[PDB]
Design a protein around this ligand. Structure first.
Ligand SMILES: Nc1ncnc2c1ncn2[C@@H]1O[C@H](COP(=O)(O)OP(=O)(O)O)[C@@H](O)[C@H]1O
Ligand SMILES: Nc1ncnc2c1ncn2[C@@H]1O[C@H](COP(=O)(O)OP(=O)(O)O)[C@@H](O)[C@H]1O
Ligand SMILES: Nc1ncnc2c1ncn2[C@@H]1O[C@H](COP(=O)(O)OP(=O)(O)O)[C@@H](O)[C@H]1O
Ligand SMILES: [Mg+2]
Ligand SMILES: [Mg+2]
Ligand SMILES: [Mg+2]
Lengths: 528, 529, 40, 98
C-alpha cells in the first residue's frame, strides 16, 4: 500500500513487525543480565573523546552503549522515568520486559491472537498487587533498620570494604536533616569530590564545603570563632542605567571626581565595619563574609585591614544551606543591618589542593544541611562512587516516606509465582494462558541470581519451590552456597515503592508492544 | 563462495565503527598484553645506570629526560587498559613526587603474573582477593624495617647526604655537586613553624658555560632591563605598586569641556604640575626604588629621573606578588605614598649582565628570606631542562622528610626482605588463596632484576646471592654497582636510603591499578573521532 | 646497521650543492657573460 | 593487535644501530663548516627560500642558516650558539672537536 505512494519507505507488515520487537527486546537482556546482584561484573565504557567510565547501573549503561533501534528506544525511556522517581530497579526493569515478551511469543507462534494474552496480563497484574500488600512489614524505621536497607543497595555497586564505609555516611546524613514532620527535602546535601588520597577517606562533614577561598594574600586562614554574614549585595563598581558621563575641567577637577564615584560602594563597606567593631570589640572572634556577587580589589583591601575573610560569587543554592547550618538571615540590602542577622560557626579553615582552593565550615550548633566529601585517586573512581551515593540516599528516603519494607533476595518473586497458579483455574476462557505466562516471567530474578553465582538454573528453583509449600516462610536464594535462606532474618530488604512501580511499568509497555501491527517510516528522511 | 551472516541480537544493533570485546579470552587476556608492553618501554630508565630517551611531541618539540612520568606525559596512548596505569603513576607525582617508575614496574609484574594463575584454574575473584590480603600484610611489615631516621633538618652537613640518593638516581656523576645546591637553598627558606613550601624555590636558566658554574642566590632575578636611568642602589626602600604609573582616569567615559580661552592655556600646565607633587611626595619618604605592574607614562618617567629614583616594571602579576614576600612590602592598589608598613628593605638592587642577558638582581645579605632562587647554567637548552627536573626531585624529597622522617634501606634490600616475609605467610594459609599470595611476593623481584639488567651483569645470580645473605639476618644488603662482578654490599653503611612515605604510597597505588583491570569483563568502545 | 638515507636537512631532496673547483669555475663563467655585454 | 597502543605512525628505533646512526649524523654537520678554519679558510654561500644570499665564514651563522631537522644533529647547532654568547670566538673549533 504505502510502497505505491512513497517508494522510499520502509514497512514491516503481518508478523514481521512482531519479529523485530521480540528480537531486539531479547538483545538488550542478554547484555543487561550480567549486572544483577552483588556478583555482577564491571563494564568498560569508552566514548569518542577517549574517556573511561566503569559503571554497573542499568540506566548509565543503556545510555552509553551505541544502539540505534526504534523499539530499543522505548525501553530506554522507561528506565529513565524510574531513576528520577525511585532511583533503583533499572536492571530488573529490562529483564522482566525482555522475558515477558519471550513467554508471550510461545503462545502467539501456536496460532493465537495477541489480544487473548493481553486480557491475561490485566488479571495477573491485579492479583499480584493484592498479594504484595500482605507481604510487606511495617516497622518503626529506627537507625538499625535503615542500616540494613541502605547496605543492600550499596553492596551491589562497590566492594565490601567501601559499602561498610558509605553506609554510615548515608544513614547519618538523612537523619541529621530530617524533622519530625514534612517530607525529607533533598538538594541540601552537597556532594563535593576532591581528587586526592584513597577512596576509604570518604567522610561526612557536619557543615559546608565551598570550592573557593579568599582572593587576598593578607587574610586569615584559621578562625576559631566567627560570625557568618550571608549576603547577596553587590560590592563591584557599577554604572548608572541611564547613559551618563563626566564633563570635567583643569586637572584638579579630575581628581575630585575619581574619589567621588566610589562613595556609593564605600558606604556599604563602612556599614559592615561598624557592625563588626560593635559585636567584636576584642580581637578574640572572627567575621566571615560570604557573598553571591563580586568584590572589587579596592573593597578587598578595606576589609582585609580588619581581618574580614570575604568570599565572592557563591552559588545560589548555598544561600539556603548557610542559613539552616549557621542560623542567620540571607539579606539583600544593608539598610537594616543588625546583630540578629549573623550566623555562627566554630572552625573556618582553608584547604589548598594544588591549583584549587577549598573552605571548610565545621562545628555548627544545630546543622540542618550536611555535606558529603568524596575522595579518590582516579577521575572515574569519583564518578563510580557518586552513582552509589545517589542510589543509597534514595533507598533511605523511600524507606522513611513509606512505613513498610519488602524482603529481597528474590524471595518475593517466588511468592507471586505460587499465588498465581492457584488463581489460574478461576479465570474463564483462553485467558488462563496469560496468567501462566505471567507467572513464568516473574521467576527471572531468581534465575539470573542463581546463574550469576555459578549454580544450576533449574536445580536451584526446584529447591526454592520445595519450600514455601510446606512452610509459610519467605525463603530466598543464598549467593554463596545456593541453599534456601530466609531473607527477613539476615538483612536483605527492598523498597515497597520500587517493587510496586516496577510491576506497573513492566506491564503497560509490554502490552502496547504486543499490539503493534506494523512499523511504518513514510515521513521525511531528515528535517531539511 | 558463501558469507557468514551476523548473529541476531546485540551484534545486529551496534552502530558502525564501534567494537565489542566480551569474555575472558578477548578482554582480560588482551588487556594484560597492552599493559605488559608499557612496562618494557620505561624499564630501561631505572636506577643509576638508566638511559635517556629522545621523545618528540606533535609540536616538533624535543624532550631528553629520564623521569618516568615525563615520558608518559609526552607519549600518546590509545589503549584504555594502558591508560589507567598512566593515571596511577601521575597520582604519586602529586602526593610524593618520587617513585613514578615503581608503579609501572609493579603494576606490570602483578598483571603478568596473574595470567599464569588464570590458566591453572583460579578464577578472577580468587586472584583479586589474594592480592588484597597480601597488600595489607606488606603495610604491617613495612614499619618494622625502618632504619636511620633523620636527625636535624637545619644542618647543612646532614641534609645534603639525605637528598643525594634522589639526585644520583637521575644525574649520575654530578650527584655530589648538585646535592650541595639544593641543600643550600632549602634550609635557607625553612621557617621556624616548619611548614615547607615548594614554590618558594625558583629556578632560572641562563645559557652559559657549564653545570659547575651554577650558583644559588638569596633573592629574585628577572630577564628584563631598567626603565629609568639609575641602575644601582646600595640601600634601597622598595615601594611596590599594583596600579600603573600615570594619571588617574575615570572608568566612565569622561571628557574635558573648555569654554574660555583662559582655561585652554592653563590645562596643559595643570596636569604637569599635579604630577610633580605626586612623584615628589613618594620621593620624600626615602623610596629609592619604585616597582610597578602597569604602564609607565612619559611625563611620569621624567620626574622619576629627576629625583634619582629607580623604576622597574614587571607585567606578570604573580611574579609581582613573589617580590612582596622577598622584601617584605605590600602592593598598593592606589597611587599614594606608603606610610610605614608598605616599604620593603633590600640590601642591593642592580642591573647586571650574565652570559649576554641583562638581569635585575634583588640580592639579600641575610640568609633568612622568603623566596630563594637557583641560577642554572649549561651549554644546551636540553641539558638545563633535564637538570631542572632533577632539582625538583630533591626539593620534593625535603618536603616529605618534613612530614615523615623515617627511612628504609634502598637499592633492593627492601623488596627482597619483603619477598621473604610474604612468602612465609602464604605457606601457613591452606586454600586456593595461597597461590596468589606467593605470586605477590615474586613480583618484588622485578625491581632488583631491573637494576641488574641495566647495569650489565647477570640478574639471576644477584637474586641468588641476595636471598642467602638475608636469610642469615642481614636485612641491610643490596646490590653493588661499582663492582664489575655481580657482588653485594651493605646499604646502611654506604648511605643509600629511601623515604618510608615514598614506598608506602607506591605499593598502595600500584595494587589498586592492577585489581581494577582484572575486574573488567566487557569493553564497549565507540567510533574514534 | 644498514645506514638508510636518514633525513638531515629539511627539504633535502629539493636542494642542490656545488663544492670544490667546479663551483669556482661557475662564478667566472657567470661574470664573463655579464662583463662581455657591457664591452660594446 | 586489534587494539593498538600508540598512534598509527609512531616511528621508533633502539639499540646499537640506533646509536651508531647518530655518530654518523654529526659527521655531516661538522663537514659543512670544515673548510672555514684558519687564515686560508673559505666562506660559504647560502640562499633562503626568497632569494636573499648570506655569504659568511663563521660557524655560528652558517649553522643557523641550515634547516637541520635531525634530533641528534640539533645538539651541535645548540652548542655553537652557546659559544658565540659566552666568548664570541672559537665557534667552528667546538664543532670539529665535538
Ligand atoms: N546481598 C544480596 N543477596 C541476595 N540478593 C540481593 C542482594 N543484594 C541485592 N539483591 C537482589 O538483587 C536484585 C537487584 O539488585 P541490583 O541489580 O543491585 O539493582 P536493581 O534492583 O536496580 O537491579 C534485588 O531485587 C535484590 O533483591
Ligand atoms: N647508588 C645506588 N645503588 C643502588 N640503587 C640505587 C642507587 N641510587 C638509587 N637507587 C635505586 O634506584 C631506584 C629507582 O630510582 P629512579 O628510577 O630514579 O626513580 P623511581 O623511584 O621513580 O623509579 C630507587 O628505588 C633506588 O632504590
Ligand atoms: N698566524 C696564525 N698562524 C697559524 N694559525 C693561526 C694564526 N692565527 C690564527 N690561527 C688559527 O686559526 C684559527 C681561527 O679559526 P676561526 O676561523 O677564527 O674559528 P672561529 O671563527 O670559530 O674562531 C685558530 O684556531 C688559530 O689556531
Ligand atoms: Mg539496586
Ligand atoms: Mg627517584
Ligand atoms: Mg675566530
Amino acid at each position: 500500500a504505502v510502497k505505491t505512494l512513497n517508494p522510499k519507505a520502509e514497512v514491516a507488515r503481518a508478523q514481521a513487525a512482531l519479529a523485530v520487537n521480540i528480537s531486539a527486546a531479547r538483545g538488550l537482556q542478554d547484555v543487561l543480565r550480567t549486572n544483577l546482584g552483588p556478583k555482577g561484573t564491571m563494564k568498560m565504557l569508552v566514548s569518542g573523546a577517549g574517556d573511561i567510565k566503569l559503571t554497573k547501573d542499568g540506566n548509565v549503561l543503556l545510555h552509553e552503549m551505541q544502539i540505534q533501534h526504534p523499539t530499543a528506544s522505548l525501553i530506554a525511556k522507561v528506565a529513565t522515568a524510574q531513576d528520577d522517581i525511585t532511583g533503583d530497579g533499572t536492571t530488573s526493569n529490562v529483564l522482566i520486559i525482555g522475558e515477558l515478551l519471550k513467554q508471550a511469543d510461545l503462545y502467539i507462534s501456536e496460532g493465537l491472537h495477541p489480544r487473548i494474552i493481553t486480557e491475561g496480563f490485566e488479571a495477573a497484574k491485579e492479583k499480584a498487587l493484592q498479594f504484595l500488600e500482605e507481604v510487606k512489614v511495617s516497622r518503626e524505621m529506627d537507625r538499625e533498620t535503615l542500616i540494613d536497607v541502605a547496605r543492600t543497595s550499596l553492596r551491589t555497586k562497590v566492594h565490601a570494604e567501601l559499602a561498610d564505609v558509605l553506609t554510615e555516611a548515608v544513614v547519618d546524613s538523612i537523619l541529621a536533616i530530617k524533622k519530625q514532620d514534612e517530607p525529607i527535602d533533598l538538594f541540601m546535601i552537597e556532594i563535593m569530590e576532591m581528587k586526592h588520597k584513597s577512596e576509604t577517606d570518604t567522610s561526612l562533614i557536619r557543615g559546608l564545603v565551598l570550592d573557593h577561598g579568599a582572593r587576598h594574600p593578607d587574610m586569615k586562614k584559621r578562625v576559631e570563632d566567627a560570625y557568618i554574614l550571608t549576603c547577596n549585595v553587590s560590592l563591584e563598581y557599577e554604572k548608572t542605567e541611564v547613559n551618563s558621563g563626566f564633563f570635567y575641567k583643569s586637572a584638579e577637577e579630575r581628581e575630585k571626581l575619581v574619589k567621588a564615584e566610589r562613595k556609593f560602594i564605600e558606604d556599604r563597606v563602612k556599614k559592615i565595619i561598624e557592625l563588626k567593631r560593635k559585636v567584636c570589640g576584642d580581637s578574640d572572634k572572627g567575621f566571615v563574609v560570604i557573598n553571591q556577587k563580586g568584590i572589587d580589589p579596592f573593597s578587598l583591601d578595606a576589609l582585609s585591614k580588619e581581618g574580614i575573610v570575604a568570599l565572592r560569587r557563591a552559588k545560589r543554592r548555598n544561600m539556603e544551606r548557610l542559613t539552616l547550618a549557621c542560623g542567620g538571615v540571607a539579606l539583600n540590602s544593608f539598610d537594616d543591618l543588625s546583630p540578629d542577622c549573623l550566623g555562627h560557626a566554630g572552625l573556618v579553615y582553608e584547604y589548598t589542593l594544588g591549583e584549587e582552593k577549598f573552605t571548610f565550615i565545621e562545628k555548627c550548633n544545630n546543622p540542618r544541611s550536611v555535606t558529603l566529601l568524596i575522595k579518590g585517586p582516579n577521575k572515574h573512581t569519583l564518578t563510580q562512587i557518586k552513582d552509589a551515593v545517589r542510589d543509597g540516599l534514595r533507598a533511605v528516603k523511600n524507606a522513611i516516606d513509606d512505613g513498610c519494607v519488602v524482603p529481597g533476595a528474590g524471595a518475593v518473586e517466588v511468592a507471586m509465582a505460587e499465588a498465581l497458579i492457584k488463581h489460574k483455574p478461576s479465570v474463564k476462557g483462553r485467558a488462563q494462558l496469560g496468567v501462566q505466562a505471567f507467572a513464568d516471567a516473574l521467576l527471572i530474578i531468581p534465575k539470573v541470581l542463581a546463574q550469576n553465582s555459578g549454580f544450576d538454573l533449574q536445580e536451584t528453583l526446584v529447591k526454592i519451590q520445595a519450600e514455601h509449600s510446606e512452610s509459610g516462610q519467605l525463603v530466598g536464594v543464598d549467593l554463596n552456597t545456593g541453599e534456601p535462606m530466609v531473607a527477613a532474618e539476615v538483612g536483605v530488604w527492598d523498597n515497597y515503592c520500587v517493587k510496586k512501580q516496577l510491576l506497573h511499568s513492566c506491564t503497560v509497555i509490554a502490552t502496547n508492544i504486543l499490539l503493534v501491527d506494523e512499523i511504518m517510516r513514510a515521513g521525511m528522511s531528515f528535517l531539511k | 563462495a558463501l558469507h557468514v551472516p551476523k548473529a541476531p541480537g546485540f551484534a545486529q544493533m551496534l552502530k558502525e565503527g564501534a567494537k565489542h570485546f566480551s569474555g575472558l579470552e578477548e578482554a582480560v587476556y588482551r588487556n594484560i598484553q597492552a599493559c605488559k608492553e608499557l612496562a618494557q618501554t620505561t624499564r630501561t630508565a631505572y636506577g643509576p645506570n638508566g638511559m635517556n630517551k629522545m621523545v618528540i611531541n606533535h609540536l616538533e618539540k624535543l624532550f631528553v629526560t629520564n623521569d618516568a612520568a615525563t615520558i608518559l606525559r609526552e607519549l600518546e596512548v590509545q589503549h584504555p587498559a594502558a591508560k589507567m596505569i598512566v593515571m596511577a603513576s601521575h597520582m604519586q607525582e602529586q602526593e610524593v613526587g618520587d617513585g613514578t617508575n615503581f608503579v609501572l614496574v609493579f603494576a606490570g609484574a602483578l598483571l603478568e603474573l596473574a595470567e599464569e594463575l588464570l590458566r591453572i584454574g583460579l578464577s578472577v575473584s580468587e586472584v583479586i582477593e589474594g592480592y588484597e590480603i597480601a597488600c595489607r600484610k606488606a603495610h604491617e611489615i613495612l614499619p618494622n624495617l625502618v632504619c636511620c631516621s633523620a636527625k636535624n633538618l637545619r644542618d647543612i652537613d646532614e641534609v645534603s647526604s639525605l637528598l643525594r640518593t634522589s639526585i644520583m638516581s637521575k644525574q649520575y656523576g654530578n650527584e655530589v655537586f648538585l646535592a650541595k645546591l639544593i641543600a643550600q637553598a632549602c634550609v635557607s627558606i625553612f621557617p621556624d613553624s616548619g611548614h615547607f613550601n615548594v614554590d618558594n624555590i625558583r629556578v632560572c636558566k641562563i645559557l652559559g658555560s657549564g653545570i659547575s658554574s651554577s650558583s644559588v642566590l638569596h633573592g629574585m632575578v628577572f630577564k628584563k632591563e631598567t626603565e629609568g636611568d639609575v641602575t644601582s642602589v646600595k640601600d634601597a626602600k622598595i615601594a611596590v605598586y599594583s596600579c600603573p604609573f600615570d594619571g588617574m582616569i575615570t572608568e566612565t567615559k569622561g571628557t574635558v569641556l573648555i569654554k574660555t580661552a583662559e582655561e585652554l592655556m592653563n590645562f596643559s600646565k595643570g596636569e604637569e604640575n599635579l604630577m610633580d607633587a605626586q612623584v615628589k611626595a613618594i620621593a620624600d619618604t626615602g623610596a629609592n626604588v619604585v616597582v610597578t605592574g602597569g604602564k609607565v607614562a612619559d611625563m611620569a618617567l621624567h620626574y622619576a629621573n629627576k629625583y634619582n629614583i629607580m623604576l622597574v616594571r614587571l607585567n606578570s602579576k604573580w611574579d609581582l606578588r613573589r617580590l612582596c614576600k622577598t622584601v617584605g612590602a605590600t602592593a598598593l592598589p592606589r597611587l599614594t605614598p606608603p606610610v610605614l608598613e608598605e616599604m620593603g628593605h633590600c640590601d642591593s638592587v642592580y642591573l647586571s649582565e650574565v652570559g649576554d642577558t641583562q638581569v635585575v638582581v634583588f640580592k639579600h645579605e641575610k640568609e633568612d628570606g622568603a623566596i630563594s632562587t637557583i641560577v642554572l647554567r649549561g651549554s644546551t637548552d636540553n641539558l638545563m631542562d633535564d637538570i631542572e627536573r632533577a632539582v625538583d626531585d630533591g626539593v620534593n624529597t625535603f618536603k616529605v622528610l618534613t612530614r615523615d622522617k623515617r627511612l628504609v634501606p634502598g637499592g633492593g634490600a627492601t623488596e627482597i626482605e619483603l619477598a621473604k616475609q610474604i612468602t612465609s605467610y602464604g605457606e601457613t594459609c591452606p586454600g586456593l588463596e595461597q597461590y596468589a599470595i606467593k605470586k605477590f611476593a615474586e613480583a618484588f623481584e622485578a625491581i632488583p632484576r631491573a637494576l641488574a639488567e641495566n647495569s650489565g651483569v647477570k640478574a639471576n645470580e644477584v637474586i641468588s646471592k641476595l636471598y642467602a645473605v638475608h636469610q642469615e639476618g642481614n636485612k641491610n644488603v643490596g646490590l653493588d654497582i661499582e663492582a664489575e662482578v655481580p657482588a653485594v654490599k651493605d646499604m646502611l653503611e654506604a648511605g643509600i636510603l629511601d623515604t618510608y612515605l615514598g614506598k608506602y604510597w607506591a605499593i598502595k597505588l600500584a595494587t589498586n591499578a592492577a585489581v581494577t583491570v582484572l575486574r573488567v569483563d566487557q569493553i564497549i568502545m565507540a567510533k574514534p573521532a | 646497521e644498514y645506514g638508510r638515507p636518514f633525513l638531515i636537512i629539511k627539504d633535502q631532496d629539493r636542494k642542490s650543492r656545488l663544492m670544490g673547483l667546479e663551483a669556482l669555475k661557475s662564478h667566472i663563467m657567470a661574470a664573463k657573460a655579464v662583463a662581455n655585454t657591457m664591452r660594446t | 593487535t586489534p587494539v593498538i597502543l600508540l598512534k598509527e605512525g609512531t616511528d621508533s628505533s633502539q639499540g646499537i644501530p640506533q646509536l651508531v646512526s647518530n655518530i654518523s649524523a654529526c659527521q655531516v654537520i661538522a663537514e659543512a663548516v670544515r673548510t672555514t678554519l684558519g687564515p686560508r679558510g673559505m666562506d660559504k654561500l647560502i640562499v633562503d627560500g626568497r632569494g636573499k644570499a648570506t655569504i659568511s665564514n663563521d660557524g655560528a651563522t652558517i649553522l643557523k642558516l641550515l634547516d637541520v631537522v635531525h634530533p641528534a644533529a640539533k645538539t651541535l647547532v645548540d652548542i655553537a650558539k652557546s659559544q658565540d654568547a659566552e666568548v664570541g670566538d672559537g665557534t667552528t673549533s667546538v664543532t670539529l672537536l665535538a
